[PDB]
Design a protein around this ligand. Structure first.
Ligand code: HEM
Ligand SMILES: O=S(=O)(Nc1ccc(Cc2ccncc2)cc1)c1ccccc1
Ligand SMILES: [Cl-]
Ligand SMILES: [Cl-]
Length: 410
C-alpha cells in the first residue's frame, strides 16, 4: 500500500521546514515505503528538472549509498538537493570546484591534501582558545539577562573555530563571518538579499591573498601544510585553496550553530537530561545533540549506473536523496530513537553523513565546539528558560533556527 502522504508532497519543500520538521511523514515512509519516489512537478524541483528523486529514509540504505561512491555520484548534480526553482544550471555546476561535490580521482587527491589540515593535532591545538572563548561567550550572554540564544550563544564559537583553524587575524574575522553568513538561507525572506555567488567570489580572492602571503611567511596553521608541495609535488593551488576556504566557511558555520541551538531546545524539553548534563557533563551528548538536530536534513547523489538498493531498482541518472533526518531516527538502529538520551553509546547516527569517501572532515571539530559551548552554558546560565518559540529557517535541506529568545536568568 502507498504511504499515507498528501498528494504532491515534496520532502525537500522549503515551506515545510520553515514551520516544522516533517517527522511523521518520514516515519510513514520508513514503515510503508522506505525507498519512495518523490515526484516533482515541472519547475518545482529546486533546480533539478528530472521529474523527482528517490527518498532514502533508512539508515542502512543511507550508509550503503555513502559507501558505494563508485556508483552514487556527488559530482553529477552536486550534493545539495534544493535551490531556488529558477537557479541556472551553471550555478549548480560551479559547485563542482569544491571537494564536497567531487568524485574520484579528483576528490581523492583533494581529500588527501586537505587531511593535512584536519589532523587530530591541528584540531586539538584549538581546544584551549576555543574553551576560553566559549566561557567568555556564555558569560557575556548571561550578563545580558535575556536575549537571542541563536545570536548570543550559538553563532560565535563555530565561526571562531574556522578563523582559528585557518589562521585568520582577529581584524579579519568580521569580514570572514559576514562572507560565511552570506551563503546559506537565500530562500528565507529574512536573507532574501544575500548573494552567495558574490560572497563566494570575494572569499576566493581573499583566500588567494592569504595563500600567496603565507607561502612567503609560513606559520603553524593548516594553510602552510596545504599550499606546500610534498615529495610528489602535491599541494593546493591558490585557487584550490580559495575553493576550500569557501567550503570551510560554509561547512563550519550554520551546521554547528544549529546543533547548539537545537541542542538547547532538546534540553529545554528534557529537563532530566539537562540536570544530568550539568552534573556529569558527558561528551557523548555532542553526538546525541547532532543526532537530534541533524543540521543537514539531506544530501543527494546521482546514480552513475543501474543499482538495486534494498529491492528498489535505481536507474542510471536518477537522483537519490539521503534524508539524514529520517535515518537518524530509524527504529531498526536506535533503541527508542525518539528518546533524547545524552548517554547514547554507541551512537551510529549519520548526522555527519554515512561513512565513506565524503565523511565529514570537521566532525570532531564540531563535537569539540559543541562540547565546549555547552560546558560554558552549564557554567554560566544553568537555569536558562526559553521565553518564546524558535523561528525556523526556510530551507529545503538545512535544518536551521534563525532566532530563539531565551531568559538566561530565571
Ligand atoms: C554539526 C556540525 C556538522 C554537520 C551536521 C556536518 C555535516 C556533514 C555531512 C552530513 C557531510 C556528508 C557529506 C556527504 O557525504 O555528501 C559532511 C561533509 C563535510 N564536512 Fe561537515 N558537518 C558539520 C561540521 C563541519 C565542520 C565544522 C567542518 C569544517 C570546519 C566541516 C567540513 C566538512 C567537509 C569539508 C565535508 C566534505 C568532505 C568530503 O567531501 O570529503 N563539517 N558534513
Ligand atoms: O561549498 S559549496 O559548493 N557546497 C556546500 C558547502 C557546505 C555545505 C554545508 C555543510 C555543512 C557541514 N558539512 C558539510 C557541508 C553544503 C554544500 C556551496 C557554497 C555556497 C553555497 C552553496 C554551496
Ligand atoms: Cl509557502
Ligand atoms: Cl563555489
Amino acid at each position: 500500500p502507498s504511504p499515507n502522504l498528501p498528494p504532491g508532497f515534496d520532502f525537500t519543500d522549503p515551506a515545510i521546514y520553515a514551520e516544522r520538521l516533517p517527522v511523521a511523514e518520514f516515519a510513514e515512509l520508513r514503515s510503508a515505503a522506505p525507498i519512495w519516489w518523490n515526484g516533482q512537478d515541472p519547475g518545482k524541483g529546486g533546480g533539478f528538472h528530472d521529474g523527482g528523486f528517490w527518498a532514502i529514509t533508512k539508515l542502512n540504505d543511507v550508509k550503503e549509498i555513502s559507501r558505494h561512491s563508485d556508483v552514487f555520484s556527488s559530482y553529477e548534480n552536486g550534493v545539495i538537493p534544493r535551490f531556488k526553482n529558477d537557479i541556472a544550471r551553471e550555478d549548480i555546476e560551479v559547485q563542482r570546484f569544491v571537494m564536497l561535490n567531487m568524485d574520484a580521482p579528483h576528490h581523492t587527491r583533494l581529500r588527501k591534501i586537505i587531511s593535512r589540515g584536519f589532523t587530530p593535532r591541528a584540531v586539538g591545538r584549538l581546544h584551549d582558545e576555543l574553551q576560553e572563548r566559549a566561557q567568555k561567550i556564555a558569560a557575556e550572554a548571561a550578563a545580558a539577562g535575556s536575549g537571542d540564544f541563536v545570536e548570543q550563544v550559538s553563532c560565535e564559537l563555530p565561526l571562531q573555530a574556522i578563523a582559528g583553524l585557518l589562521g585568520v587575524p582577529q581584524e579579519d574575522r568580521g569580514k570572514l563571518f559576514h562572507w560565511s553568513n552570506e551563503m546559506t538561507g537565500n530562500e528565507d525572506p529574512e536573507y532574501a538579499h544575500i548573494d552567495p555567488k558574490a560572497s563566494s567570489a570575494e572569499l576566493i580572492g581573499y583566500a588567494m591573498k592569504m595563500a600567496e602571503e603565507k607561502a612567503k611567511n609560513p606559520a603553524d596553521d593548516i594553510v602552510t601544510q596545504l599550499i606546500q608541495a610534498d615529495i610528489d609535488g602535491e599541494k593546493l593551488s591558490d585557487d584550490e585553496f580559495g575553493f576550500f576556504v569557501v567550503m570551510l566557511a560554509v561547512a563550519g558555520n550554520e551546521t554547528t550553530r544549529n546543533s547548539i541551538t537545537q541542542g538547547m531546545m532538546a534540553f529545554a524539553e528534557h529537563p532530566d537530561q539537562w540536570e544530568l548534563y550539568k552534573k556529569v557533563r558527558p561528551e557523548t551528548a555532542a553526538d546525541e545533540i547532532v543526532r537530534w538536530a541533524t543540521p543537514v536534513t539531506a544530501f543527494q547523489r546521482t546514480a552513475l549506473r543501474d543499482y538495486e538498493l534494498s529491492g528498489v531498482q535505481i536507474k542510471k541518472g536518477q537522483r537519490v536523496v539521503m534524508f539524514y533526518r529520517s535515518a537518524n531516527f530509524d527504529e531498526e538502529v536506535f533503541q527508542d530513537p525518539f528518546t533524547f538520551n545524552i548517554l547514547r553509546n554507541p551512537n551510529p547516527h549519520v548526522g555527519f553523513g554515512g561513512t565513506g569517501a565524503h565523511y565529514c572532515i570537521g566532525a570532531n571539530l564540531a563535537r569539540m565546539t559543541i562540547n565546549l559551548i555547552f560546558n560554558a552554558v552549564a557554567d554560566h546560565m544553568p537555569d536558562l528558560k526559553p521565553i518564546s518559540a524558535p523561528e525556523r529557517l526556510r530551507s529545503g535541506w538545512l535544518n536551521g533556527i534563525k532566532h530563539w529568545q531565551v531568559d538566561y536568568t530565571g
